[PDB]
Symmetry: D2
Subunit: 389 residues, 4 copies
Amino acid sequence: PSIVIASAARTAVGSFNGAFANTPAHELGATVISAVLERAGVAAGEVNEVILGQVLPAGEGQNPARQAAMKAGVPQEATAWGMNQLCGSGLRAVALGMQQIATGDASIIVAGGMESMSMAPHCAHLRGGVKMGDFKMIDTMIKDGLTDAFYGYHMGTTAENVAKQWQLSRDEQDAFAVASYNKAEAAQKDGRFKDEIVPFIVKGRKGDITVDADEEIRGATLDSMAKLRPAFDKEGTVTAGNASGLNDGAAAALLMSEAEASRRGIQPLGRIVSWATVGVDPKVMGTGPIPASRKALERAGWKIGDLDLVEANEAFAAQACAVNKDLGWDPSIVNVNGGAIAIGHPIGASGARILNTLLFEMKRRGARKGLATLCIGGGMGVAMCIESL
Amino acid sequence: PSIVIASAARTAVGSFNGAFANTPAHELGATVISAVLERAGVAAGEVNEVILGQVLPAGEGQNPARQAAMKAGVPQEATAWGMNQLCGSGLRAVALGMQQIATGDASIIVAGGMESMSMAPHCAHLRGGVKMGDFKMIDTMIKDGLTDAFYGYHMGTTAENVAKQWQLSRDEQDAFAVASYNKAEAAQKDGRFKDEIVPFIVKGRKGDITVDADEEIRGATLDSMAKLRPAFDKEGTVTAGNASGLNDGAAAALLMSEAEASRRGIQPLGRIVSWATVGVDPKVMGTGPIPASRKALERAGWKIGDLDLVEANEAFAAQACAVNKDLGWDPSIVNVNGGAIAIGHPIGASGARILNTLLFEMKRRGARKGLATLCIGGGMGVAMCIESL
Amino acid sequence: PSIVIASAARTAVGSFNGAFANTPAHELGATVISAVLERAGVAAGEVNEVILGQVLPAGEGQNPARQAAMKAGVPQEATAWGMNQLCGSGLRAVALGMQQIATGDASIIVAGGMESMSMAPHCAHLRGGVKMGDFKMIDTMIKDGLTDAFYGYHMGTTAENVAKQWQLSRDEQDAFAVASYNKAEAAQKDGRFKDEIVPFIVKGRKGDITVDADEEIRGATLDSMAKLRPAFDKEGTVTAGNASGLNDGAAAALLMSEAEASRRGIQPLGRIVSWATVGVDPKVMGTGPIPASRKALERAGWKIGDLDLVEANEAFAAQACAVNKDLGWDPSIVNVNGGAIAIGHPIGASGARILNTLLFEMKRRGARKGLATLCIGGGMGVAMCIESL
Amino acid sequence: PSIVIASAARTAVGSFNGAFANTPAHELGATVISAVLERAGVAAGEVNEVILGQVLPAGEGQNPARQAAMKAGVPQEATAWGMNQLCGSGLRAVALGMQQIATGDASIIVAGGMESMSMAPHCAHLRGGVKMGDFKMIDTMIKDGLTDAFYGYHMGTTAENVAKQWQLSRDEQDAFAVASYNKAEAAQKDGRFKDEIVPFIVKGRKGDITVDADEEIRGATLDSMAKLRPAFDKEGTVTAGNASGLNDGAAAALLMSEAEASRRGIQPLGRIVSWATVGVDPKVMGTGPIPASRKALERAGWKIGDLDLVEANEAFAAQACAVNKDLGWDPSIVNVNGGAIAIGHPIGASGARILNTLLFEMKRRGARKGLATLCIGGGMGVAMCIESL
Ligand SMILES: CC(C)(COP(=O)(O)OP(=O)(O)OC[C@H]1O[C@@H](n2cnc3c(N)ncnc32)[C@H](O)[C@@H]1OP(=O)(O)O)[C@@H](O)C(=O)NCCC(=O)NCCS
Ligand SMILES: CC(C)(COP(=O)(O)OP(=O)(O)OC[C@H]1O[C@@H](n2cnc3c(N)ncnc32)[C@H](O)[C@@H]1OP(=O)(O)O)[C@@H](O)C(=O)NCCC(=O)NCCS
Ligand SMILES: CC(C)(COP(=O)(O)OP(=O)(O)OC[C@H]1O[C@@H](n2cnc3c(N)ncnc32)[C@H](O)[C@@H]1OP(=O)(O)O)[C@@H](O)C(=O)NCCC(=O)NCCS
Ligand SMILES: CC(C)(COP(=O)(O)OP(=O)(O)OC[C@H]1O[C@@H](n2cnc3c(N)ncnc32)[C@H](O)[C@@H]1OP(=O)(O)O)[C@@H](O)C(=O)NCCC(=O)NCCS
Ligand SMILES: [Cl-]
Ligand SMILES: [Cl-]
């Protein structure tokens, strides 16, 4: 069978404790679900299932994916569930939703990801009681999202391991960072994000605020990156500038068979040709996209040179430089409008975020063969190949 | 294609703050993952992916499914992720794992569920700061697992609504409870749970303790159940006895193609013929399995009378009577060895728990056509049809 | 015997989460202790005991009064302790320190009060453990400082009771408020607070900041005060403007016998002639100063008309108007430089704050007979009479 | 003037999380206040002021001393306040109340101490917000009661400093421990605690329980105490047996002039002749009573040999041996009925607890000149001399 992406939308990537500081994840997910239905002309009463990836759902209630679907207008007859493959969750939900229609068990799937790292609460197991002494209040964002459970240190330390393993100097990593900021700043000015971004209405008590611009996009220079202190180790290279930040947002895509799009007169953004996921050593989780993209290309029967456009998520400057240096694809086609270093890294939603950036990127310049991939904590990677119709 | 279940295992369902009081979820998941590999003769280096459902992973670290696979012995080459469809998570992971091999994207899948409601922490959003006044510490088990996010009350209140519409007397619900305990009492005595249960070693500081028996099995009487006070409403019918409890445990199943099983000389427990999931009104979420089982049966080409054994999860006595009364299947084949009212309700693992109980019961008494289904909070249901080889 | 006040000092009253947001109470107290020693020519090695009132010391460590004395330079040979009579703590410590020298058990006492309501933590009894359900995180400032333990409502409700019992209109309370702001702002412009205020250096990571002005002194308007909604009752008269705020600060005074001051050539600010404390009904705790000041005046043998200057703490506009209406003293001599409505209300330190304001105003204009008094939560009041040497 | 102790009472010292696990301090204080009034024939409407020492009042509400007086029956006209000199609060409150009558400002004072270390909550300053990362939940009992704010370690470490500097072997410390337990067991068997102890009725949901016996009194052996591991240092000498525990309780005494007692026909337990408090190095806070008792004896004009009975609080076995070795008084008259090692150490109430034990023992065996003293955290000590009428 053939599965296409009829429409795709995403909210503007918000800053940590920024515009979406007090906005739950499912409310951001409800906006993109309603948006992909409007952009494709499909009614809510036709969605079979909603698949939204989310890593930090603590305190939001029973199944925020169902809450997002019901709030967006999807009726009670449909189903919904959340998945967690860390950073590659947003892209795997699209592949999982692709398999739902592939196995003949569904006809229309709204799949994507949503994440609100600002609303992540602090937790502590208190059922057994604390008879005496102090106890830690654990940050769910850091513990369940940003710390490798096998070695105990942050994901930035795994980037330091990649930097030591590939011999990536502080100047070479900062040079890759400023390139991402310069490509993202030009894209926001030229309006290359307006098609992907659906405006979100932050309902506040002191009036309403419309968010329709990635607020983590700033202007960095090569000298403003050499003054940043290392954020993870006292003798390291990864700083707050050459590393992706903590962000909120949501993204989704409307999936359907290739015959259904022709029946509805829908012109899909692209067709899902192949997907893949492979694991690596958690010490060097940043090398995840290397065998994942090659396995995706191997299943699609495509060479690396056949690709016309690449979206490789920039979790860190060290991991992004190695993947580009190793795969050897033309860096002029990788993250043409910037990357997660300049846009943001909403863990649950970043998988579908770079998919939105890629799908509209293939349409805007006439690219035919695209590829999106991300690195995953704990030593994993996911990749998907998209062809234009 | 054809997907079979080569092996299945489950831990004993532990009580709230009982044997697994201080045991993380992924440790229980590691035992079942390693068990299904031993019972089938498949090495750990052959698992492509691990799909484990889990509702309450707060404070356990990055992707507890990955931690369970690595601790069980699954190498770094494989991938892993967690899913959340509330109570139907344990069963949907099997269907999702079936689709991985169906689409030719995987060869060996270890799928199931794990949940540790005792290790569920209390949380509170504290990033924005508390300027003044008291703030609540939210229990993640109740909030993210046992409260409908659309009406705000407990799952027990939804059972009262099902009881009001289906005319289920106070005595008729207690009669279903004692029937579940008496069938569970006979199953534990006759040893019909020893094959499915894999022993877990609770390593404590005062020696080691082996857990290989469901510690929630007691002897209930009809008069000891009519004196229980309603635990959810001041004037109701749902009590602590006729409702599922808070429990810990894990369960899984090894998935593989039917040709691969014959090539390895494995005798599969059964073949996955059909699956389905549909949503219902959140007011009567206990009626989830009603439209789900018919959709699963219609895809398999089976009549309702064709089933030889049924495992319908007993979230509440009210919901179980309604699901049985509407489909009209012979009550002698539903939960022959007892149900969740007497065994326990590990949210993430209950979907695969009743699958293990069904698979080993179908094999020991020669049943050919089986069906497992559960109700899901928020108004959903999941069902799977299994045939024996 | 005769006990005089050789010197007195106070820190600038800081706003809630303002200049002293991250400054512990004992650090503010150490500055005032060092100040009263410099202004009197007495060394730190001569202080026999340090008595500092403090209402909210939770989480600050063992006996913050001892920490303030040690940090200020008082040697280990001396003693120190903290007391708690709520809002009258700052003034009762002076009377208690006066009794130390009166009974011949001490010769030089540094007495006063300190409070940091911004550093008040949230607490919860967790030793018995929370098996199930949510639990409240109790604000120590609200619970242990601003809530009557006999009727359960805020201290602002007791002001409403005083307003209802004394028939104090909303316009009369706001008129008293703007009068307090105008007297304090004009006093701050004319520099009538520089003598009392000792500058505090808030050592922050982004440089040092000197605080030498009560930062809650603002310009209020009658129309900007009549639009404020009542903060305690939905249909009431006490608002955030006509009520004292939550504030941080410290104040103290160096006590010594009248003969020792003449031996040291010190000109004391005043002599403590009489003191008194009496209790009232907790429903109308604002009437505390009424029988306390009358008992203090009778012990000194003074009539109400004999007073030349009065400092009656303005906890609320309702409580302050009632005290003036009952005692009947000339309002032109009460709070000449403003009150707690415009300066601030650090509960533990407010008792010594108005003492500093009274002592320095009596000295500059030649007043001989003064009286300071405050209302106390739970239905109490404290008052002290000061005569000039 | 002359101030006598007309009556005295105390609650049984409860164990940590024991009989008084859920009993607030002021409820224990209300029982002792009512008890000292009945034993002297004085009504509650005659008490001028209530002075209760308390170290851990976090979360109990506004001024727990006021709550204890009101619940015991003291009318609203009277006043009440709490003081905090750590371990010397219970005894210094008696001295402060003695000075109230000495300066002619009061006639009848109910003074003592109360402490409920089991009800001590965990706290954390959360107004400024936790931007990122984990934060500790501070135990108010450990932080504000048992940790030296100048060196950061527990009070047990100060005992280790005393033990190393005074040449006190670990076996000599354990030998002092069993002597305290054996003297307490014999005193409890012979009923020498019945006069001082007033029964407390713990009102629980499962019926009422009368507590009239110190539940921390057990039978210890020399070999069961020499096998205990040091609780403060990994290679130390202070164990859980030779150190005082965490306990709850309350104690008080009714103070009045010697002439007023004769007017009422009251036979006082003793007359307060002298009191004193002096500070020492916080490194060796256990040596507090050494210069404090010498100063108290010098104010009374008594030599050490003039004492007939001594109550020296046993905070630790190391500090108690050093105080006896330096002062050189006959150990046969010190703690005849046992000490805090076997009875308990309620911080706020220990000062008045050993006062009750001293007052009733001096009366029962005819002792004339007595002395009570305790060591105080942060490097202080307090002592009081009592003579018989
Ligand atoms: C690195 C990290 C800790 C930054 O945390 P942060 O401090 O709250 O973010 P900030 O923007 O405040 O960075 C701190 C400083 O750097 C500055 N800064 C950020 N980006 C900059 C840039 N491009 N140029 C210059 N300065 C920059 C900030 O303005 C700030 O200024 P300050 O010195 O006054 O504080 C966070 O982004 C991170 O850990 N990212 C990786 C997390 C993650 O998702 N890992 C998994 C990926 S798979
Ligand atoms: C978990 C649950 C049992 C809570 O009841 P509970 O009040 O917390 O149970 P308790 O903590 O009071 O302790 C268990 C009590 O039940 C009693 N009990 C348990 N099984 C019993 C039996 N078979 N016969 C008689 N009494 C029994 C115990 O003796 C105890 O009595 P007690 O209250 O006097 O001490 C249940 O009411 C519930 O809330 N389930 C929610 C989980 C859920 O939603 N499942 C469906 C998912 S859709
Ligand atoms: C009354 C109380 C709850 C105020 O709470 P608060 O909101 O945190 O204090 P605020 O100053 O921030 O009041 C908030 C609003 O009122 C405004 N406001 C405050 N004082 C004002 C004034 N004098 N004129 C005009 N506006 C004023 C603030 O600017 C703010 O407006 P905005 O936030 O809408 O822009 C608090 O001050 C209080 O409870 N005090 C009681 C003290 C007490 O009990 N003492 C012991 C009694 S013995
Ligand atoms: C010493 C201290 C750390 C121990 O706390 P604790 O361990 O909770 O006290 P416990 O009652 O639980 O004693 C626990 C252990 O010691 C043993 N123990 C206690 N008292 C004993 C005794 N009298 N004889 C023999 N063994 C004893 C217990 O049985 C247990 O050993 P176990 O593991 O074999 O069961 C704690 O009491 C403390 O900090 N005390 C200091 C109090 C203080 O500083 N007061 C102020 C003085 S200035
Ligand atoms: Cl002196
Ligand atoms: Cl009197």
